[model samples]
Target chain A: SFATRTSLAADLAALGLAWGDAIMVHAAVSRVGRLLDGPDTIIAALRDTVGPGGTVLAYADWEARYEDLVDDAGRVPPEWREHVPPFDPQRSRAIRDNGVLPEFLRTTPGTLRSGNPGASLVALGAKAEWFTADHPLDYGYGEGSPLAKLVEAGGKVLMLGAPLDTLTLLHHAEHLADIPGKRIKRIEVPFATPTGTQWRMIEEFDTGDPIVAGLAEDYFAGIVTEFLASGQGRQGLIGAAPSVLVDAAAITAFGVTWLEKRFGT
Target chain B: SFATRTSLAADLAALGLAWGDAIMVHAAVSRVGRLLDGPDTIIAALRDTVGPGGTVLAYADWEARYEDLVDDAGRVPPEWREHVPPFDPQRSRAIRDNGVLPEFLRTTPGTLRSGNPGASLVALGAKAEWFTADHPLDYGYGEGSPLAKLVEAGGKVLMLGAPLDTLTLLHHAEHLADIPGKRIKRIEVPFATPTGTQWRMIEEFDTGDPIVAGLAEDYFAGIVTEFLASGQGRQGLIGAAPSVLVDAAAITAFGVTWLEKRFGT
Candidate 1:
């Protein structure tokens, strides 16, 4: 059983989301406890609450096929040259573990995605193009990426029954951290560019490390908790699922100052 | 009619280079009037000046052919797939315009080269492995590159007949700058890895531009000159060519701070 859009909308409002609020969401539908409708209800409820003027963004990580193509030494299996499907930003499946919400947001009409091969994000609304237009191949989570734009545009993040570890906003923080000698990765994947389908190599600071580890002392403590402590977070319950709201700019700024001090960058 | 290794060694010492100093060298062998024992004398002079305890490095840019292989939208030419020669760090030729120094130094025995294809560097001496190891595929002159290590170790840059614009060390400064929306480039070129040959995509900040343009009134009034004005440079002559010596750590630190203000980074 699943909750209806009407029910989800009531809960979202209860959590203080309002009409025309631009939000980046990381959701866990299964964590919604019970539902009468499907994942569409969750997305529609988000849309209904945010209204036409508002924007919704989600991450579209396609790692299973892309990341697994090359071996440890960056050698591809012979079969990969012939069989690995090229990434079509509009059609490739989201990493299954990122949950069902991102895929749904990416495929929805009017959604636009950044063409970055490794860390792509999908946005829908008035700011979609503004967010996805020119993602730099290096440091894809930094200034030119959607995440940085989201922070600058007074966007907010909604953790809809999802855990803090699933929050991708932290990556923007990592991009801003002044730390030197950070581990960056070299990823080669076949993705479609305007010219054609080709193998694109991306060099970006490694975004995979657990940033949550350094900020908290308790198992329950995470970025959201640390952010709330800084007086920049909003919290409430939605359909028996605990949800959190955070102003994108404040937290990202806080993250930069905080990480610099913590890491001595 | 020509300079011998013994004479060149005397000239290097006169330029303020010394035993036990780690150095990054940029030279134009032809511009050095003449060399009695060929470019090897230049390499030997540097080695003799620095001693076995010191490290000497040279940039081995492959762009003469590699940069041109990309089409207008930055793709490998169709014919390139069938014929582009793989980069063998041990044997690949340096860009002819970079002068004869890099090729001579790279092929010298006991020299280790970083594996980053687009901006590989070769090194010699005890610290050679330390400087050349683990260059990030992107931002090849930044925090983890040989250039960064040179700065960290209090190394020096010796421009032997090479202009200030030829100072590859400036890229390291660009890497550490806090600028957002910096234009980075994506380049794909084939090079060797342990498994075999592969096309690697590299995302680096646009190092091709003349970084001194917006700041200075004339071409002669660039970074190295600015550094000299800061009273951080030492100058002299090598053969008929005027050369400059600057402390790697101080100049690079100055570059980051200098560019930050100039570009409002």
Candidate 2:
């Protein structure tokens, strides 16, 4: 059966979404079964559920291609530096691996996207600007980042038929977790200045791999499973796909506790 | 070797692209082999080749899904009509089948996109606005359309590693061809008006199939091959991909002549 805006709205409401709730959504539209207008329907349904007062947010990180990146030796070839176009917050596309919704959200009119190319978040609605403003280049998913703003603003994470490992808020937890030897990654990103393109270095907790060693392959999924076991979130079905709606703060705290307990020395 | 902006710019220059040329481009990046920044390199290369005074244009037709369409029976179910979001010229995505460049061009800052939903074109550079303004929705590829405007403006069509059959300017020729019994298609599209959503019916040459009966399966390819054989365009290699740069007016005229010759009574 095709999911319409009305049906998806009902499902969203039943899953605990309400008026004026700011949400960070991770969605796999295909898992939601047949949709009338594909991602547009899901976005509309989210808008309808939250009304005009609320904001919808999505992770819209830009893909840093290896060829464009400085090698592990921390040097960029002069030819690449001369030719690579600077990243424009308005023009650079959201990383494709995050699925279609983020790119769709990023392009939707009146949506504000953050400056951090590596970990930008796109938001639409009343708090859109508040959610995306002044995103830091250092520890992009940590303090003062959009992820932090999502938690501070009492936001919820909507796992709309997406996999358990896709919970990105946990990265904020990884940043917050009181564990020793949390890996950090630094990379030079090309940015457009008034005069010309500049290579700006950005540092973030290594989100590319498990934050700590000797953990399960799907550590994020394991954390989410345990968080679910502790009854920290609501679960239901949106279309044919299982969906979870959790408070951003609660999940991050849970993820922090899980990481610290396992890795603290 | 990876195709860099400098290398691509050199190739494009060699292929007859020069400063101040308004060109419509059809590109398959994969066929171009490894590119440093992918589509960004190609776009930058074209920008370099054409300089600031020139314009780059791309076909950015929007996909009207079957479920959203008014059925062949000329009826729309009220339920479907009420819930579907109206298309915003700024928000609607370019049809994916056109490959990635059109959408990339549509989103690039300072690019002007025509208002026609199903047959919109995106243009960038000095003549962007001039090329895109007042695009008529009816017979969108015909007289007074952007395709016609391209020819009138002495624009060239750049086929960069794209298949010959991928030429879209031929549709303009199909519209111009003085042949009897050309097929026409009409579709109702949802547009956002001041009051609310309005369903506007658009009519055009049926570009979905061969305009006339008994043509070969690859009719467009046949036309292009014969045009190439007649030495109407410049051909060269852009990276690993075969590329063509043709005068839009000449090839379109050739298409019209070919169509009229075969199908005219």
Q: Give the best candidate by lDDT.
A: 2
Error of 1 at A96 (Å): 61
Best by DockQ: 2
What are the DockQ scores of the candidates, in order?
Answer: 0.01, 0.50
TM-score of chain A of 1: 0.89
The residue-by-residue lDDT of candidate 2 on B51-114, one tens digit each, is 9999999989875564445678444567678666577777777877857889778777778888
TM-score of chain A of each: 0.89, 0.96
* Per-model TM-score versus the true fold: 0.48, 0.95
Model 1 residue B167 CA deviation in Å = 0.3
For candidate 2, lDDT tens digit of each residue in A70-136? Answer: 7784456775687665788887778879588998888778888999887889999999988989988
Give the least accurate 10-residue stretch of model 1 chain B, judged by summed lDDT.
B212-221
Q: Where is model 2 more than 4 Å wrong at Cα?
A: A67-69, B67-69, B73-75
lDDT score, candidate 2, position B219: 85
Error of 1 at A249 (Å): 81
Model 2 / residue A167 / CA error / Å: 1.7
